[PDB]
Write a protein that binds this ligand. Sequence first.
Ligand SMILES: CCCCCCCCCCCCO[C@@H]1O[C@H](CO)[C@@H](O[C@H]2O[C@H](CO)[C@@H](O)[C@H](O)[C@H]2O)[C@H](O)[C@H]1O
Ligand SMILES: CCCCCCCCCCCCO[C@@H]1O[C@H](CO)[C@@H](O[C@H]2O[C@H](CO)[C@@H](O)[C@H](O)[C@H]2O)[C@H](O)[C@H]1O
Ligand SMILES: CCCCCCCCCCCCO[C@@H]1O[C@H](CO)[C@@H](O[C@H]2O[C@H](CO)[C@@H](O)[C@H](O)[C@H]2O)[C@H](O)[C@H]1O
Ligand SMILES: CCCCCCCCCCCCO[C@@H]1O[C@H](CO)[C@@H](O[C@H]2O[C@H](CO)[C@@H](O)[C@H](O)[C@H]2O)[C@H](O)[C@H]1O
Ligand SMILES: N=C(N)NC(=N)NCCc1ccc(I)c(Cl)c1
Ligand SMILES: N=C(N)NC(=N)NCCc1ccc(I)c(Cl)c1
Lengths: 171, 98, 48, 104, 83, 347, 311, 174
Amino acid sequence: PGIVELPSLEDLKVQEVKVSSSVLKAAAHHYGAQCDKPNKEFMLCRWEEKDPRRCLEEGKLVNQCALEFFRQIKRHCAEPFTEYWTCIDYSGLQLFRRCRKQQAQFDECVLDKLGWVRPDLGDLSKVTKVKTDRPLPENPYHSRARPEPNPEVEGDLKPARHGSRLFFWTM
Amino acid sequence: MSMVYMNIMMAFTVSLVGLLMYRSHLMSSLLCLEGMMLSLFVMAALTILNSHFTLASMMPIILLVFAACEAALGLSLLVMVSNTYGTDYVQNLNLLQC
Amino acid sequence: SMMKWNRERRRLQIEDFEARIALMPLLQAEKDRRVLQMLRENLEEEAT
Amino acid sequence: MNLMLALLTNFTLATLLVIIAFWLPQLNVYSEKGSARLPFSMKFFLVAITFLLFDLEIALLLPLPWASQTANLNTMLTMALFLIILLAVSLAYEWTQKGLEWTE
Amino acid sequence: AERVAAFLKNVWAKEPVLVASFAIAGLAVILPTLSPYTKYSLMINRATPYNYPVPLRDDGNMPDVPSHPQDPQGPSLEWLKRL
Amino acid sequence: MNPIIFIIILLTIMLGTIIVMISSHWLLVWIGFEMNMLAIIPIMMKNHNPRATEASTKYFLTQSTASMLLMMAVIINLMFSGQWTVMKLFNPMASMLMTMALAMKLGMAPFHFWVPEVTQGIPLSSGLILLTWQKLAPMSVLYQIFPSINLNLILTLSVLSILIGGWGGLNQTQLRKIMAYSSIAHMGWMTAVLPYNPTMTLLNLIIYIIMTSTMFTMFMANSTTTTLSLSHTWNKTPIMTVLILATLLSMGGLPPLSGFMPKWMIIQEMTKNNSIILPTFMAITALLNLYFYMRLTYSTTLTMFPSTNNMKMKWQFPLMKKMTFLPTMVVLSTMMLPLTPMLSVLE
Amino acid sequence: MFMINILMLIIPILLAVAFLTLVERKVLGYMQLRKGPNVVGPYGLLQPIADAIKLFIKEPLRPATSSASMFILAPIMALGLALTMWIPLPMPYPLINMNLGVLFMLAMSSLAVYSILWSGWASNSKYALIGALRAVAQTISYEVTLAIILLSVLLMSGSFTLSTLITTQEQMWLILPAWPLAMMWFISTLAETNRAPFDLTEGESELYAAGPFALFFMAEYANIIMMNIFTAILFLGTSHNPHMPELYTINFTIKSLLLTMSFLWIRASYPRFRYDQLMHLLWKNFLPLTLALCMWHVSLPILTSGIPPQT
Amino acid sequence: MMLYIVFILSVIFVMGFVGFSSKPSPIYGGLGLIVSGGVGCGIVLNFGGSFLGLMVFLIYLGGMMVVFGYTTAMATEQYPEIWLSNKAVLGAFVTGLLMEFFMVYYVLKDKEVEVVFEFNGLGDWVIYDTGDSGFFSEEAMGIAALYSYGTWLVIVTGWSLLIGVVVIMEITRG
Ligand SMILES: CCCCCCCCCCCCO[C@@H]1O[C@H](CO)[C@@H](O[C@H]2O[C@H](CO)[C@@H](O)[C@H](O)[C@H]2O)[C@H](O)[C@H]1O
Ligand SMILES: CCCCCCCCCCCCO[C@@H]1O[C@H](CO)[C@@H](O[C@H]2O[C@H](CO)[C@@H](O)[C@H](O)[C@H]2O)[C@H](O)[C@H]1O
Ligand SMILES: CCCCCCCCCCCCO[C@@H]1O[C@H](CO)[C@@H](O[C@H]2O[C@H](CO)[C@@H](O)[C@H](O)[C@H]2O)[C@H](O)[C@H]1O
Ligand SMILES: CCCCCCCCCCCCO[C@@H]1O[C@H](CO)[C@@H](O[C@H]2O[C@H](CO)[C@@H](O)[C@H](O)[C@H]2O)[C@H](O)[C@H]1O
Ligand SMILES: N=C(N)NC(=N)NCCc1ccc(I)c(Cl)c1
Ligand SMILES: N=C(N)NC(=N)NCCc1ccc(I)c(Cl)c1
C-alpha cells in the first residue's frame, strides 16, 4: 500500500481562538450570523471532500473570521459581553434562560455599536446555499471501476424443446 | 481481534462445556444456559457499540427479552419435573430409555 | 400547565441546539488540525 | 472513577460494620452454652414467573421517553399502545383463568 | 342505549376500578385522533435540529434556499414562538 | 386445553416457522425459532404424565442449546462482516456452528438421540407436528446458507444419519420410535443432496412430509402406537391395512410408488457431479429402512395376526376420528411417480 | 475532596436513620395519647444512642447457618445497596450526576430483594425460608407498578436524569397533573418497604439479633427515608436557585421529612392487609389502573403538543 | 493500569463463568452468575452502553436471576452444599482457572497471544472511536428507534411474551 500523505506541522499552524466554551456560547448567536459565509464554505468543503486534508485553507479562514469577530466585540462591547458570558459560565449547564438580563445588555450594545441583529429562533438551523469556486469532487470515495454486470438474458420465451426432457418423459 | 473478545468467547466456551457436561441438578444446567446468553449479550453489545451500528443497539435487548422468556419456560419444566420426582435430578428423566 | 412549560422548554432546547450549530464549523476546523498534527507527530517518531 | 469510589466505600463500610458487629469483646471464659421440593404452593412460582414476563415487557416500554422525540409519531404511538394493550391482555388472561387466585 | 346504560351502572357500582381503567384506556386510544394540537407535536419534533444543517452548493437556480440564515427563505419558526 | 387456546398455540407454531422463512435478518430468524419452540412445548405436555414431561424437558434442552449456538454463529458473522443478512456466512467457524445448530434442531446423527425419545413420549398428533412441520424452518435456513457449508461436515452428517436411522429402526416395536428413526434416515438424504442441488432437497422434504403425515394419520385413526396393536387393524378396518401397505412400500422407495422419486432424483444429481460411491452406499444402506418397513407390512396386511374377543364389540361402531386429508395424502404418497417432471415447479 | 463528600453523605444518612427511630416512637406515642421516649436524654434525644450501643454489645446469637457466606452476604448487600441509592439524588446537586439516574435507582432497588432471599437460605429453617419467599413475592409484585408509574411520570419530564425532574416542576408540582399516579406510587412504596399496612413479614412471623439485626434495621430505615426523598422529587419538585442552593435543600428536606412522617402516621391508623388481599390490591387494582394511566400518559403529551425536550 | 479496565473486568467475567460452569450447589452457581452479570454490565458500560449496561442489572439480575434464585429455593436447593466439597467440581474449577491464568499471563507478557485464534494484547482502548461531539446518546437513539423503525420487531416480540404467559399457564396446570 501507499504512504498516508500528511501535511507538515507548519502547514497546520494558525492563530487559535483561545476562549472558553462559555465565551463561545455567549457569542454563538451573533457569531453564527456574522461569520456564516466562511463557515458554510468550510462545512460544504468538509462534507463534499470527506477529507480534512483537502479543506485546511478553508479552515484557516474560519479561524480568521472568528478572531476578527471577537476583536470587534473587544473593541466596542467588552464590558457587557464580559458580564454576559460570566453569567453563562456560572451555570453547570450553561443555560441561556438564566442570563436574559445580561444578554439584553450585550445584545443592545452590539446593535448600537455594530448593527448586529441576533438571529431569530430557527434561523441558524436553516439549510443555506454556498457559492464556491472550488470544483465539485468527482470520485470523493476513490471508488474503483465497478464490475461489469452479468450479460443480460433476453428474447422471446418459447416452449422447452421436446418438453422436460427428463429421462423417458415426452412432455 | 481485540483482547476483550478472547475472554468473552472463552466465557461462552466455558458455559457451553458446563452445559454439555451435566452433573445431577437440572437447575445447574439451566444456569449454564443463561451463562451462554449473558456472554452472547456482552459480545453482541461490544461489537455493536464499538462499530457504532446505531439501529443494532436494540438487538441485545431483544436477545435478553426472548432468552428470559425461554428461561421462564425452562424453569416451569424444572418445577414440573420436581413435582413428579421430588428433585430436579436429570437421572430421574430416563423413562424414555424404553 | 405542563403543556405550556414543555413547549417553552422545547423552544429553549432549539435555541441551545442552534448555538451549537453556530460553533460547529469552528470546532470542526480545530478538530481537523489537531488530528492531523497528532498523526504527523506520530509519523516523525515512527521514522526514528 | 467517582462512581467506583462511591460503590467501594458503600460496600466496604457495610462490610466493616458487619464484621465488627460479629466480633466484639464478650468477657466470658467458659465453653459456649436438603435439596427437595419445599412445601410451597405452585401459586408462588406463578407469581415470580408472572413478574418476570411483565418485567420483560417493562424493559420494552422503558425507551418510550426517547421514542416520543421521533418524527414518526404516528407509528410510535400506535406501537406503544399495542405493547401496553398486549400487557393488559396478558393480565386479563391470567385473571379470567384464575391465575391471580390464592384459594385452593 | 338503555340496556347498555343499565350495564354501565352495574359495573360502576361493582367494579369502579375496572370501569375507570377501561375509560382511561379508551381515551388514550381515541383522543389523539380528535385533538387539534396533535399535529403540532409532529412539527415541533421535526423543528429540533439535532445535527448540522449541511449547506447546498449553489448552482444558481435555488431561489427558495436562503443564502444567509437571516434571509427570509426557508422554514420559519414563527408558528412555534406563538404556540 | 381450551380449543381456542389450542388453535392460537398452533397458529403460533406456524407463525414462528413462517417468520424464519420470510426473514432476511438473522435476528428475526432466531426469533422465529424461539417463538416456535415456545409454542410447541405445550402440545407436547398436553396429556400430563411423567413421560410427556420428560420428553418436553429433553426437547427444551436440545433446542435451547441449538438456538444459543445459532446465536453465537450469527454474532461471529456480525463481527467478521458487519451485517445481519440471511445468506452465506462470512466465517468458517460461524458456518460450522450454524450447521451444527441446525443439525441439532433437525435431530441429525450424531445429534439424534432426542428424536426417538421425544417422539415416543408425546401423543401421535404432537409427534406428527414434530417430525413434519418442525423440519421446515431448519431446512429453509440450510437452503439459504449452503454456499458456505463445509462439504465434508454436511456429508458426514448425512451418511451418519442414514446409517443410524437404518440401524436404529431395526430394533423397534414402538410405532413412534420407528417413525423417529425413519425420520433420521430421511433427513440424511435431504442434506446429502443439498450441496449439489437444493431443489432436490425441497422435493425430498415435501414427499417426506406427505408420506409421514399419511402414516401418523392412519395410526391416529385406529389409536395404534405399537406393532401388535397395529396388527389388529385387519380385523377392524381392512381398507386401512391396504393403505398402510402402499404407504410403507412407498416410504421404502420401491418403484413405481411416489417415495422412489426423491431417491431417484437425488442419485441423478449426485452422479452428474461424479459422486458415485456415496449415492450407491446411500441406496444400499436405505435397504435397512425397507426391511423394518416390510416387517410392519407382514404383521399388518400380508398376514392375519391373532385377535381378541372384545374386538367384536368394536365391529358395531364406525370410525369417528377426523382423518383430515387422509384420502388425498395416501394417493399422493403412492401414485405420483408418473408426474415426476412436475418437480421443476420447486425451482 | 470527593471522599469528604462521600462521608458527608454516609454519616448523616446513618444519623438520620438513628433519630428516625426516636421520631417514629414519639409520633406514634402522641397519636396513642402517650409520650414515647422522654427519659433517656432530654426529650429522649439519647434514646437512639442507648439502643445502638445496647444492640452492638449484645450477644450475636446466630444459629449454625446452612451457609456462612450467605449469612454474611445478606446484611452487607442490604446496607451497601441502601447507601448506594442515595448517590444520584439531587439535593439539589447529586454526588454522582448520572444521565440515567432514574434507571440506576430502579436497577439497584431491584437487587435489594437478594438480601431477603439470601437471609432466608442462611436461616437453615424451612419456615423462615417460606417467610422469605412470601416477602420476595410481595416485593417483586409491587416493583411492577413502581416501574410503570415511574415511566409514566418521565413521559412528562423527558429524560431519565433525576435533576431534570427539578426543571420539569419549575412552574408546578407534578402531583397536580399526576395525582392518580402519586396515590398509587405512595402506596407502592409502603408495600415495597414492607411498611404497615403491608408489614406482613412482622405480622406473619408473630402469628436476627444484636449488630446484624441492627444492620438490617438500618438498611430498612435508610430505604424508607430514600423512598420519601424520591417521592418529593418525583411529585413535589422544589425550585432551585443556583445562587442559593441551600434554600432548595431546606425546602426539599421539609417535604421529605413530612412524607416520612406520613409513613408513621399511616402505621398508626390502619389494620394490616391479609397476604392475598395485598396481592389483589396490586394485580387486580393498581396494575389495571397503572396500565391504563401508562397508556394515557404516552398519548397525552402527543395529543396536547406537550412533549418535553430530550436534553 | 486503568487503561486495562475492560480486560481486567473480562478476566473476572471468565472466573465467574468457571465458577458456576463447574456447577457447585445451584445456590452458589447462582451467585457466580450474579457476579458475572455485574462484571458483564461493567464491560458494556465502558464501551459507552449505559442503557444496555443498566438493562443487565435491571432485567437480567433483578428480573431473571431473582426468579432463578426464587425457584431454586423452592424446587431445587434449600440449603447449600459446602462449596468445592465435591472433587469433580474442584477439578473443573481449578482447571478453568489454570487455563485462564495462562492466557492472562501470556497475553500480558507478549501483549498478544494465540489461544486457538490470535488476539491482540495492547489494550482494548486502541480500537475506540476518536471523533464524538453529538448532543445525544447514540445508543439511546438506536434503542428509541424500536418504536419508529421496528414495528415488525415490536409485534413479534409482544406476541411472544403474551404466548409465554399462556404457555406457562398450560405447562404448570398439570
Ligand atoms: C375501550 C378500549 C380500551 C382498550 C382496553 C385495553 C384491552 C384490555 C383487554 C381486557 C379484556 C378483558 O375481558 C374480560 O373478559 C371476561 C370474560 O370472562 C369478562 O368477565 C366475565 O367473566 C367474569 C369472571 O371472570 C364474570 O364474573 C363476569 O360476569 C363476566 O363479565 C369481562 O367482562 C371482560 O372485560
Ligand atoms: C391490540 C391492538 C392495539 C392497537 C392500538 C393502536 C391504537 C392507535 C391509536 C392512535 C393512532 C392515531 O394517533 C394519532 O392519530 C392522528 C390522526 O388524526 C395522527 O395525525 C395527526 O398527527 C400527524 C403527525 O404525523 C399530523 O400530520 C396530522 O395532521 C394529525 O392529524 C397522529 O399522527 C396519530 O398520533
Ligand atoms: C464449539 C466451540 C465454539 C466456541 C466459539 C469461540 C469463538 C470462535 C471465534 C471465531 C473467530 C475467529 O475465526 C477465525 O479468524 C481468523 C482471522 O481472525 C480467520 O483467518 C484465519 O484463517 C484464514 C485461512 O484462509 C486466514 O484468514 C488466516 O490464515 C487466518 O487468520 C479464520 O478463517 C477464522 O476461522
Ligand atoms: C457501639 C460501640 C460501643 C462500644 C462499647 C465497648 C464496650 C466493650 C465491653 C463489652 C461488654 C459486653 O458484656 C458482655 O456481653 C456479652 C454479650 O455476648 C454477654 O454474654 C456473654 O457472657 C455470658 C456469660 O456471662 C455467656 O453465656 C454468653 O454466651 C456471652 O456472649 C456478657 O454477659 C456481657 O458481660
Ligand atoms: N443447483 C443445481 N445444481 N441445480 C440447478 N438448480 N441448476 C440450475 C439449472 C436448472 C435446471 C432446471 C430448471 I426447470 C431450471 Cl429453471 C434451471
Ligand atoms: N420501630 C421503632 N421505631 N422502635 C424500635 N423498635 N426501634 C429499633 C431501635 C434501633 C434499631 C437500630 C438502631 I442503629 C437504633 Cl439507633 C435503634
